[PDB]
Amino acid sequence: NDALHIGLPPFLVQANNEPRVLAAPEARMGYVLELVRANIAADGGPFAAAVFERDSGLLIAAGTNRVVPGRCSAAHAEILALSLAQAKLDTHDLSADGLPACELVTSAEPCVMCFGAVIWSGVRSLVCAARSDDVEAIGFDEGPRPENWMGGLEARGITVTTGLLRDAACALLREYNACNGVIYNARC
Amino acid sequence: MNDALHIGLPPFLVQANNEPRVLAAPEARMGYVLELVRANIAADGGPFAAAVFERDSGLLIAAGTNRVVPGRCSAAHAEILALSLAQAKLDTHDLSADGLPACELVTSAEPCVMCFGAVIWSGVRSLVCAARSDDVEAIGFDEGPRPENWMGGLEARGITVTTGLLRDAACALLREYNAC
Ligand SMILES: Nc1ccn([C@@H]2O[C@H](CO)[C@@H](O)[C@H]2O)c(=O)n1
Ligand SMILES: [Zn+2]
Ligand SMILES: [Zn+2]
Numbered sequence: 091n092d093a094l095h096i097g098l099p100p101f102l103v104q105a106n107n108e109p110r111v112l113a114a115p116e117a118r119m120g121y122v123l124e125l126v127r128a129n130i131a132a133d134g135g136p137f138a139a140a141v142f143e144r145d146s147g148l149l150i151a152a153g154t155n156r157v158v159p160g161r162c163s164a165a166h167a168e169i170l171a172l173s174l175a176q177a178k179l180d181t182h183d184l185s186a187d188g189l190p191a192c193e194l195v196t197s198a199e200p201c202v203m204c205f206g207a208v209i210w211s212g213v214r215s216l217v218c219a220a221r222s223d224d225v226e227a228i229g230f231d232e233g234p235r236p237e238n239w240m241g242g243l244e245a246r247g248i249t250v251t252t253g254l255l256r257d258a259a260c261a262l263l264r265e266y267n268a269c270n271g272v273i274y275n276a277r278c
Numbered sequence: 279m280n281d282a283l284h285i286g287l288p289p290f291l292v293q294a295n296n297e298p299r300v301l302a303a304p305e306a307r308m309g310y311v312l313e314l315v316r317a318n319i320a321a322d323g324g325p326f327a328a329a330v331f332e333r334d335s336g337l338l339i340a341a342g343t344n345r346v347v348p349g350r351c352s353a354a355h356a357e358i359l360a361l362s363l364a365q366a367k368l369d370t371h372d373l374s375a376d377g378l379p380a381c382e383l384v385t386s387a388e389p390c391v392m393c394f395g396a397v398i399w400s401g402v403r404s405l406v407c408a409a410r411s412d413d414v415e416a417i418g419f420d421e422g423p424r425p426e427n428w429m430g431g432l433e434a435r436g437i438t439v440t441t442g443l444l445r446d447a448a449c450a451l452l453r454e455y456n457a458c
Contacts, residue, residue, distance in 0.1 A: 092292045094285040094354075094362050103281045162362050163371045163399040164353070173283050173351050182352045203399060206392025206422050210352040233395050234431040242423040 096160045096170065099132040101125075105140075105152040106174060113147040118195045119219055119255045122152070126197045126262050129154035129167075136266035139167040139196035141175035141184070144215055150192065151175035168196055168204035172211045184212030193217060197259050198225050199252055202233035209246055216243060218252040219259035228263050285349050285359065288321040290314070291341060294329075295363055299338035307331050307384045308408055308444045311341075315386050315451050318343035318356075325417070325455035328356040328385035330364035330373070333404050339381065340364035357385055357393035361400045373401030382406060386448050387414050388441060391422035398435055405432060406440040408448035417456040 098106070105125060112118045118140070125138035135155025142149055153170025157163055171194060176182055184192040192213045198220035200208060208216055222232045236242055240250045269278035287295070294314060301307045307329070314327035324344030331338055342359025346352055360383060365371055373381040382404035383397060388411045397405055411421045425431055429439045 091295060091363070091367060093287050094283075094359055094366070096283040098282045106281070157371050161365050161369060161371050163365060163401070164358050164362050164396050165371075169353050170283055173353050176350050176352060177279075177283070180350055182346045182350050182354075201395060201399075202425075203392055203395025206390060206395060207353050209422055210390075210392060212352065233398055234425045234428070236391070236423040236425040239423065 096156060096162055096165050098170075099129070099134070099154075099156070099159070101128045101132060102152065102154055105149075110149040111147045112142065112149065115195075115217060115251070115254055118142055118147065119197075119217065119259075121149075122195050122197055123219065123255060123258055123262060125152055125154055126259070130262075130266055133159050135167075136263050137167040137197050139171040139194055141171050141213065142193050142195060143190040144193040145191060151178055164203065166201065166204050168194065168200055169207055171196075172207055172213070176211070185214065186212065191215075198230075198263070199232065201231070202235045205235050205239055205243075208243065208248065214247065215249040216251070217254055218250075219255050220263060221252060221256065224256070224260050225263065228260075228267055230263070285345060285351055285354055287345070287359075288318070288323070288343075288348075290317040290321060291343055294341040295367075300336050301331065301338065302336040304384075304406060304440070304443060307336060308406065309447075310338075311384050311386055312408065312444060312447055312451060314341055314343055315448070318345075319451075319455055322348045324356075324419075325452050326356040326386050328360040328383055330360050330402065331382050331384055333380040333382040335379070340367055353392065355390065355393050357383065357389055358396055360385075361396055361402065365400070374403065375401065380404070387411075387452075388421065390420065391424040394424055394428055394432075397432065397437065403436060404438045404440070406443055408442070408444045409452055410441065410445060413445070413449050413452055417452050
C-alpha cells in the first residue's frame with residue numbers, strides 16, 4: 091500500500107532474466123505467443139507483449155496481462171512490457187539519447203489505454219498479431235480509440251505492422267475463451 | 279528492483295494513501311487533489327495529481343501523482359497510480375464489483391488518451407476534472423490522440439463527467455510549474 095507493485099509470475103521473470111535475441115519478426119511474435127499460452131496457464135489474460143531492440147532483435151523486457159491476479163486493471167501486457175523495459179534501461183523515454191530504437195511486439199492490437207501508452211513510451215514501432223476485429227468478435231473490448239488510430243501512430247513516427255502470425259494468435263484467443271467458463275472441464 | 283513492476287511513491291504520497299480523509303464536498307475533494315499537485319512538483323514530479331474517492335461519502339481511497347520522470351515510467355500518470363492503488367487497497371481489479379461503494383476519480387486535469395482508457399477499464403463511475411485539455415497543452419503537455427467527444431465516450435459507458443472544477447486554481451499551479 092506504500093507503492094504500486096505488480097508481481098510477475100515465475101515464467102515472466104524467467105523471460106525477463108534470460109538473454110534472448112530474435113532477429114526475424116516471426117521469431118519475435120512466435121516468442122510473444124509462447125508467453126500468451128504460458129500466461130493463461132498462470133491465471134492471466136490471453137495477452138502478451140515484448141519490447142525488443144529494433145535493429146538487433148535483443149529482448150529488453152516482456153509483459154503479460156496480469157489484471158486479475160494482480161488486482162490492477164492497468165496491468166495489460168503492453169503496460170508491463172513497456173514499463174519493465176523502461177525500468178531496465180533506467181529511463182521513462184525509450185527514445186532517449188544513446189538508447190537503441192525499440193519495438194513493441196504484441197499478441198493483439200492495443201486497447202485505447204495501451205494505444206496511448208505506446209505513444210508516450212518512446213518505442214519507434216508496433217508489431218501486432220491478432221486484429222481488433224478478432225479480439226472484439228471474441229468478446230474482448232478494445233475501447234473507444236480515435237479514428238484511424240494506426241494513422242495517428244504513423245504521424246507520431248511510430249511504424250505499425252499488424253496481422254503477424256494472426257492465425258496462431260487467434261487460435262490462442264479462442265482456446266482461452268473455450269475454457270473461460272465456471273463449469274469445470276477436464277480438458278481445461 | 280528487478281522482477282515485478284514496482285513504482286515507488288514519494289513520502290507525501292505514501293502519507294496521503296494511509297491517513298484517513300473524508301471530504302464530502304466536490305470542491306473539498308478537488309482542493310485536496312490540488313494540494314497533492316504542489317507537493318508532487320516539490321518532489322520532482324509532474325504538475326498532476328488525482329485521487330479515488332467513494333462517490334457519495336467522499337472517503338478517500340487512494341491518491342496518485344505524475345511520477346513519470348523520477349519513476350522512469352511513462353505510464354506513471356496520476357490517474358494510473360490513483361486507480362491502481364485504489365484497486366490494490368480494495369483487493370480487486372474492478373472498482374464496480376458488486377457490493378463496493380461507487381467510486382469517483384477526482385483529477386487535477388482532463389485525462390490523456392492513455393488515462394482516458396484506464397478510467398474506462400477501472401470501474402469508477404464518475405470522473406471530475408479541474409484544468410481543461412487546453413490548459414494542459416498550454417504548458418507543453420500532450421493529451422494525445424483521444425477519440426472525438428471523449429466525454430461522451432465516457433458517459434456512454436456509465437461514467438459521469440464533470441469538468442472545470444477549481445479550474446483556475448489548477449491553472450495557477452500549471453503556470454507556476456511551467457515558469458519554474
Ligand atoms: N487489446 C486487449 C483487449 C482486451 N484485454 C483484456 O481482456 C478483457 C476484455 O476485453 C479486458 O478487461 C482486458 O483485461 C487486453 O488486455 N488487451
Ligand atoms: Zn491495453
Ligand atoms: Zn494520462
